[PDB]
C-alpha cells in the first residue's frame, strides 16, 4: 500500500525486494550485506538506505544492543537527506527514528525529529499529536499544551488531542476544565485514547468535584484491563501479587523490620523533631497535587532505592538503623521519609503508581484526636511507636483535624511475593 520507490528505485526493484526478502525471513546478517551492496552500488537509493536502517533495527533487537540501534537511528536520518525521497518513505523512516530515540531515552533528540516531521508534513494531524507526546515525555507540559491547542483549533474533535489536553489540564489542577476533554476523548474511541492514564484521572477529577459517576469510569477501566480492580488502580503492576488494602507485620514477613522500628521509634522521632526545629528546610512540601487543603511536607532519606547522603546527615542514627534492611533501602519503587501533616489538611483520595511496594507507617508524634487514614473501605488510626502497613496501590485518603502537628515515618518495602530476580530487574519508579 505505501509507495516507497522513486523513479530509480523502481529500476532496481528486484534487487531491493531480494534484499528485503532476506530480512523478512530473519537472515539479518545476509540482509545487512545485501543492503550494504545496494547502498554501495546505489548510494542515493532511499529504499536501499531504509533497508540498511531496518536491518540494523532488527540486528539491535536480536543483540539487545543500544549502540547498534543508535546506528539505525542515524541511518534512518540519512534516508531523509537523500534526494527524490517518496513522501511515504520519508514519513516511515523519520517516525521510526523518533520511536527508537524515545526507546533509548533520547527525549531531546526525538523532539527534533518530531519537529522536522511536522514541518515536512504540516497537514498531518497525527504528527502534531506525536510532537505533544515528545514534550510530555521530556517534562515540557507548556509546549505540550500549545501543540494540542493548535491541533484542536483545526480539528476540534480529534479524540487523541482531547485526552492529552485533558491530562495536561488535570495535571495543572484545572479539574473542572479537564473532565469534558478526558470524557469526550475516551468516548471518541480514537487510537491512543484507550489508556489507563485517562481513565485514572477522569475518575479522580470527578471524585474531586463530587461527581458520583466517577466509579463508572473506574469500572470501565477495569473492564478494559487497565486496572486490577475498581479500588486498586496503580498502572505499573506485576500481575498476580496479593491484592489487599491492609497488611499485618507477619503477613508481610518483614517482622524483623517492624520490631526494629517499634523498638527504636523514639530515636527516629527525635531526629525528625530535631530537623523540624533546626533544619526545617529539609522538609519539602508535597508536590503532586494530592491536597485539597492544608500543610504537608516530607523529609526523604531514600528514594528509588538510593540514599540521599545530605539528608542522612540530618538523621544519621535513623539512616544507620535502616541500612540493616535492604527490603526497604533497596525498594526502588518506594521511599523512606518523614511525613509531617498539620491541622486543616485533607489528602484527596488517590492511589500510588505501582503494586510492587507495600507502605509502612510508624507513628512518631500522633495527637490523640483528629488524625485518621482510610484505605479502600476501611479506616484506621495511627499510634506512637506502632507500625501500620497498607497497599497504597489501593485508593487511600487522610484527614488531619488535630490541634497540633502529626509526624510519622513512612517506610516502603518490596511486595513480599516479588522474587529477588524481579526486585533487581523491575524499572525504578
Amino acid at each position: 500500500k505505501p509507495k516507497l520507490l522513486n523513479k530509480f528505485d523502481k529500476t532496481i526493484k528486484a534487487e531491493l525486494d531480494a534484499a528485503e526478502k532476506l530480512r523478512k525471513r530473519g537472515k539479518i546478517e545476509e540482509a545487512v550485506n545485501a543492503f550494504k551492496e545496494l547502498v554501495r552500488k546505489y548510494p542515493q537509493s532511499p529504499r536501499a538506505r531504509y533497508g540498511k536502517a531496518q536491518c540494523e533495527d532488527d540486528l539491535a533487537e536480536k543483540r539487545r544492543s543500544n549502540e547498534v540501534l543508535r546506528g539505525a537511528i542515524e541511518t534512518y536520518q540519512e534516508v531523509a537527506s537523500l534526494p527524490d525521497v517518496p513522501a511515504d518513505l520519508l514519513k516511515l523512516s523519520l517516525k521510526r527514528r523518533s520511536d527508537r530515540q524515545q526507546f533509548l531515552g533520547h527525549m531531546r533528540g526525538s523532539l527534533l525529529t518530531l519537529q522536522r516531521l511536522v514541518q515536512l508534513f504540516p497537514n498531518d494531524t497525527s504528527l502534531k499529536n506525536d510532537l505533544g507526546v515528545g514534550y510530555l515525555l521530556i517534562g515540557d507540559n507548556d509546549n505540550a499544551k500549545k501543540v494540542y491547542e493548535e491541533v484542536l483549533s483545526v480539528t476540534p474533535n480529534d479524540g487523541f488531542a482531547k485526552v492529552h489536553y485533558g491530562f495536561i489540564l488535570k495535571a495543572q489542577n484545572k479539574i473542572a476544565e479537564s473532565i469534558p476533554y478526558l470524557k469526550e476523548g475516551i468516548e471518541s474511541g480514537d487510537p491512543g485514547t484507550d489508556d489507563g492514564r485517562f481513565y485514572f484521572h477522569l475518575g479522580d477529577a470527578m471524585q474531586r468535584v463530587g461527581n458520583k459517576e466517577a466509579y463508572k469510569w473506574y469500572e470501565l477501566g477495569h473492564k478494559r484491563g487497565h486496572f486490577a480492580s475498581v479500588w486498586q488502580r496503580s498502572l505499573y503492576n506485576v500481575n498476580g501479587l496479593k491484592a489487599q488494602p491492609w497488611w499485618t507485620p507477619k503477613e508481610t514477613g518483614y517482622t524483623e523490620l517492624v520490631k526494629s522500628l517499634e523498638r527504636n521509634w523514639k530515636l527516629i522521632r527525635d531526629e525528625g523533631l530535631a530537623v523540624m526545629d533546626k533544619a526545617k528546610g529539609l522538609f519539602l512540601p508535597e508536590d503532586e497535587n494530592l491536597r485539597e487543603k492544608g500543610d504537608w511536607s516530607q523529609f526523604t532519606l531514600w528514594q528509588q532505592g538510593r540514599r540521599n547522603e545530605n539528608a542522612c546527615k540530618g538523621a544519621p542514627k535513623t539512616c544507620t538503623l535502616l541500612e540493616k534492611f535492604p527490603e526497604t533501602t533497596g525498594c526502588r519503587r518506594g521511599q523512606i521519609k518523614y511525613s509531617i501533616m498539620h491541622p486543616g489538611t485533607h489528602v484527596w483520595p488517590h492511589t500510588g503508581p505501582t503494586n510492587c511496594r507495600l507502605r509502612m507507617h510508624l507513628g512518631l508524634v500522633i495527637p490523640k484526636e483528629g488524625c485518621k487514614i482510610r484505605c479502600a473501605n476501611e479506616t484506621k488510626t495511627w499510634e506512637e511507636g506502632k507500625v501500620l502497613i497498607f497497599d497504597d496501590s489501593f485508593e487511600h485518603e487522610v484527614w488531619q483535624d488535630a490541634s497540633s502537628f502529626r509526624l510519622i515515618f513512612i517506610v516502603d518495602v518490596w511486595h513480599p511475593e516479588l522474587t529477588p530476580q524481579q526486585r533487581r530487574s523491575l524499572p525504578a519508579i
Binding site: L69, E288, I429
Partner: peptide
C-alpha cells in the same frame, strides 16, 4: 518529575534502552 506518591506524570519510569 517523579511519581513518588501518585500517578500525576505522563510516564513514571525513565527509559534506558535495552535490558
Amino acid at each position: 518529575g517523579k511519581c513518588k506518591d501518585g500517578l500525576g506524570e505522563y510516564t513514571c519510569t525513565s527509559l534506558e534502552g535495552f535490558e
